[PDB]
Nucleic acid binder design. Structure first.
Ligand SMILES: [Mn+2]
Ligand SMILES: [Mn+2]
Length: 425
DNA sequence: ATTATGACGCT
């Protein structure tokens, strides 16, 4: 009872830009705004691979990782923006720079953890305490929450439902207790409305967000009401929400581990996990995963919001699938040079912007017919930002994979260069 | 012949 900690100490938000690459292209080209549109990479093979889809296009069934020619069968009016191509590969620079715009606005409100190019976690605990003291007892007006959904409410037209749920929540709120978790989540949501307003004002970009007590719940909440909306998942809403929540929807359970939870335990939903002791879970899934599952199914997770706005590694990758696989020495060299040239550009810009130097080069390759996604990964020293030297070293480091007797065999279906091990400069 | 990345765990 009194000693079971309930993981309500923090207020954590997950902000995710709605169809981010598409919005970047729609800001740049107004003809695309408020239309079915998608962003593609390459164009020759089946019109190119789609990597981002507006919500209007999604209503027709267009999805990521779908060929553009097939998407056009579902949505003949679909509009397409193409990723920039440089040195024969996709260049994502425009989206990394748009991402930094967004991150820099978010960083004004609270400390953020860049979780991907288009999403960050926010630790709002201090911000909420400060704002609570600023209110000095004033109750929270629904006007301050114009796009917030309260998950699980109403209980007992879409916007009509939203407002009813919010009204029930706010009427139930105990504004005089500055230590109530539910009040703290609520103030966190007010701040997140303000953050999302500043992002849209200063970039034109819309986003969704989740507000809860930890990263996993914030992330799960963010996806409940998209696009352009935010969802508050309270501690108290977890039993009902998790009672029908497929295990695969929880972050890190979408793959093999989640499938083995399902197969070994004979269950489907997150909430069923409550029935197992911690020791049982550790026995099946190992001590770390067991403790984590035992707490997570009760809505409790302790992973911190790391103060990290910048990526930890800077990487350059290209697949050479099918008959385009690289089969000669000249080919492997020239593409290592193209990759190393993009890497040099991004690294020099990174050193100037962020006062740091990478010190290790990671070279990863895939050979044709190899089952694995990395057929090999080897590291060497990264001592100067020179594309010719980095390409020469990556070669030097992979070349004993060639089994020919100027040819290259097995042909290579992927090259990958990654600068890592950053040190302040 | 989804592709381009990027974080993190295991050993
Ligand atoms: Mn997104
Ligand atoms: Mn995202």
């Amino acid at each position: 009872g009194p000693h079971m900690a309930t993981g309500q100490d923090r207020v954590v938000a997950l902000v995710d830009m709605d169809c981010f690459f598409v919005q970047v292209e729609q800001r740049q080209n107004p003809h695309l705004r408020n239309k079915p549109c998608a962003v593609v990479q390459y164009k020759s093979w089946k019109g190119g691979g789609i990597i981002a889809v507006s919500y209007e296009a999604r209503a027709f069934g267009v999805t990521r990782s779908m060929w553009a020619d097939d998407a056009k069968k579902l949505c003949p009016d679909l509009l397409l923006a193409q990723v920039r191509e440089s040195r024969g590969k996709a260049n994502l620079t425009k989206y990394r720079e748009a991402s930094v715009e967004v991150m820099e606005i978010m960083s004004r409100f609270a400390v953020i953890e860049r979780a991907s190019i288009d999403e960050a976690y926010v630790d709002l605990t201090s911000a909420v305490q400060e704002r609570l003291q600023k209110l000095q007892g004033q109750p929270i007006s629904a006007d301050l929450l114009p796009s917030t959904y309260i998950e699980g409410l109403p209980q007992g037209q879409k916007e009509g439902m939203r407002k009813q749920g919010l009204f029930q929540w706010l009427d139930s709120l105990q504004i005089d207790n500055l230590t109530s978790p539910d009040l703290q989540l609520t103030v966190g949501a007010v701040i997140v409305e303000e953050m999302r307003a500043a992002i849209e004002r200063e970039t034109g970009f819309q986003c969704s967000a989740g507000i809860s007590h930890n990263k996993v719940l914030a992330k799960l909440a963010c996806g409940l009401n998209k696009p352009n909306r935010q969802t508050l998942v309270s501690h108290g809403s977890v039993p009902q929400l998790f009672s029908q929540m497929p295990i695969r929807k929880i972050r890190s359970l979408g793959g093999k581990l989640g499938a083995s939870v399902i197969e070994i335990l004979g269950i489907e939903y997150m909430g069923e996990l409550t029935q197992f002791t911690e020791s049982q879970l550790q026995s099946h899934f190992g001590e770390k995963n067991g403790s984590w599952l035992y707490a997570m199914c009760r809505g409790i997770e302790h992973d911190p919001v790391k103060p990290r706005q910048l990526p930890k590694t800077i990487g350059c990758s290209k697949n050479f699938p099918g008959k385009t696989a690289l089969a000669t020495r000249e080919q492997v060299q020239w593409w290592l040079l193209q990759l190393a040239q993009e890497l040099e550009e991004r690294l020099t810009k990174d050193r100037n912007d962020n006062d740091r130097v990478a010190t290790q080069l990671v070279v990863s390759i895939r050979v044709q017919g190899d089952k694995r996604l990395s057929s090999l990964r080897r590291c060497c020293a990264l001592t100067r930002y020179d594309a010719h030297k980095m390409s020469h070293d990556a070669f030097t480091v992979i070349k004993n994979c060639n089994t020919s007797g100027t040819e290259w065999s097995p042909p290579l279906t992927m090259l990958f260069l990654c600068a890592t091990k950053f040190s302040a400069s």
